[PDB]
Amino acid sequence: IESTEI
Amino acid sequence: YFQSVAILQKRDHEGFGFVLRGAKAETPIEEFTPTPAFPALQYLESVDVEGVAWKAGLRTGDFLIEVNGVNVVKVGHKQVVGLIRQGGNRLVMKVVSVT
Numbered sequence A: 001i002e003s004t005e006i
Numbered sequence B: 001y002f003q004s005v006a007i008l009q010k011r012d013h014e015g016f017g018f019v020l021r022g023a024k025a026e027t028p029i030e031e032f033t034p035t036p037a038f039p040a041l042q043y044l045e046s047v048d049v050e051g052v053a054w055k056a057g058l059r060t061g062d063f064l065i066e067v068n069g070v071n072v073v074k075v076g077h078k079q080v081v082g083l084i085r086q087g088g089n090r091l092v093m094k095v096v097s098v099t
Helices: B077-086
Strands: A002-005 B002-009 B018-022 B042-047 B063-067 B090-097
Touching (some): A002 B077
Antiparallel strands (some): A002 B018, B002 B090, B018 B042, B042 B063
C-alpha cells in the first residue's frame, strides 16, 4: 500500500 | 457508499490538496473484487482543510472511481497518480463516500 500527496 | 462528482481547478504550483492511498500494481490487482465496504483500490488518506479538494466536498475515506473519464476501481497506485498528474490543473473525479 502506497501513499502520494496530490 | 454514495457517489459524488467533484471538479477541482488549481493553480500551476499548488496541489489539489489530498493524499491518495492504495495498493501498487505489484499486488494482484487482477484478483481485486470490489465490495460495498471496499469498492475501489485507491482512496483518500487525507484532505487538506485549506485546499481545493476540501472545498469541493472531498473527505478522508472517499474511494476513487473515475479520473477524467477513466475508471480506476481496479488500477494500481502509481498508474492512478499518473492519470491525475496528466490532467494538469484540472481534475474531474468521481468518488464514493460515506456521506
